[PDB]
């Protein structure tokens, strides 16, 4: 019932233990492994966290919203096909073309940001090679990042300051880095301990642990 964090603790030790930045030639292109490309991450976001709770839409164009009564909507990017999820977990499905009264006002919100997100933001990862829909399990804000912990066990971060992320799989133990200049980049955890990577990407895998350490603390 972890949802993978305690796997993601243990990846995150271990790399970090190593100290991937402080060898005499770091080799951090060698860590990089093709089969381990996330195939969901979170695109843009909405912080309407005062009233009525987090919109996002994932790289896939499919949109989502996390409640503040903690129920979930997901419009499918087929723009119609929606995934609502009760606050035990109970899952239905339905279209927006022949929606309910009970879901008018959630299905008026999806749209807001839907819109919101199309018309005002950028998306996270856009020239990626496109090659089950999670959800957003929880998320927080530190001053310093978003933290955002999807359904498939998939953590990610992103940055506030240079708009730097991190995009972490406990299932492929990987990181994937989208550095200030949106260079996207895959590394196998495990290879990142054998041949070391940059002190930027080593003092953000170290943020990152603490930052898992508190998903594991607030459950």
């Given at each position: 019932?972890?949802?993978?964090?305690?796997?993601?603790?243990?990846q995150?030790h271990s790399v970090?233990?190593?100290?991937?930045?402080?060898?005499?030639?770091?080799?951090?292109?060698?860590?990089?492994?093709?089969?381990?490309?996330?195939?969901?991450?979170?695109?843009?976001?909405?912080?309407?966290?005062?009233?009525?709770?987090?919109?996002?839409?994932?790289?896939?164009?499919?949109?989502?919203?996390?409640?503040?009564?903690?129920?979930?909507?997901?419009?499918?990017?087929?723009?119609?096909?929606?995934?609502?999820?009760?606050?035990?977990?109970?899952?239905?499905?339905?279209?927006?073309?022949?929606?309910?009264?009970?879901?008018?006002?959630?299905?008026?919100?999806?749209?807001?940001?839907?819109?919101?997100?199309?018309?005002?933001?950028?998306?996270?990862?856009?020239?990626?090679?496109?090659?089950?829909?999670?959800?957003?399990?929880?998320?927080?804000?530190?001053?310093?990042?978003?933290?955002?912990?999807?359904?498939?066990?998939?953590?990610?971060?992103?940055?506030?300051?240079?708009?730097?992320?991190?995009?972490?799989?406990?299932?492929?133990?990987?990181?994937?880095?989208?550095?200030?200049?949106?260079?996207?980049?895959?590394?196998?955890?495990?290879?990142?301990?054998?041949?070391?990577?940059?002190?930027?990407?080593?003092?953000?895998?170290?943020?990152?642990?603490?930052?898992?350490?508190?998903?594991?603390?607030?459950?």
């Open positions: 019932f972890d949802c993978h964090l305690s796997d993601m603790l243990q995150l970090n233990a190593s100290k991937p930045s402080e060898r005499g030639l770091v080799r951090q292109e060698e860590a990089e492994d093709p089969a381990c490309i996330p195939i969901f991450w979170v695109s843009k976001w909405v912080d309407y966290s005062d009233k009525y709770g987090l919109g996002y839409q994932l790289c896939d164009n499919s949109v989502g919203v996390l409640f503040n009564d903690s129920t979930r909507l997901i419009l499918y990017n087929d723009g119609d096909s929606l995934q609502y999820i009760e606050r035990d977990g109970t899952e239905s499905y339905l279209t927006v073309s022949s929606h309910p009264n009970s879901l008018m006002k959630k299905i008026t919100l999806l749209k807001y940001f839907r819109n919101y997100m199309s018309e005002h933001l950028l998306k996270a990862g856009a020239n990626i090679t496109p090659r089950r829909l999670p959800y957003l399990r929880t998320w927080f804000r530190t001053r310093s990042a978003i933290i955002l912990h999807l359904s498939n066990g998939s953590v990610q971060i992103n940055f506030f300051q240079d708009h730097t992320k991190l995009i972490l799989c406990p299932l492929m133990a990987a990181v994937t880095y989208i550095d200030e200049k949106r260079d996207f980049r895959t590394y196998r955890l495990s290879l990142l301990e054998e041949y070391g990577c940059c002190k930027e990407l080593a003092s953000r895998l170290r943020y990152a642990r603490t930052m898992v350490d508190k998903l594991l603390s607030s459950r």
